[PDB]
């Protein structure tokens, strides 16, 4: 979810990850990405 996304240092996005990150869980109801 946001909160482990975020404090375990990653970022939500709904859809592409960028570049040198991957797909590590979700956020937001699960309709976004946590991209590390």
Known sequence: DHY???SSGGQC????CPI???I???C???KAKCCK
């Open 24 to 26: 590590e869980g979700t």
């Open 28 to 30: 937001y109801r699960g």
């Open 20 to 22: 040198f990150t991957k």
């Open 13 to 16: 996005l709904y859809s592409a």
């Open 4 to 6: 482990n996304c975020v």
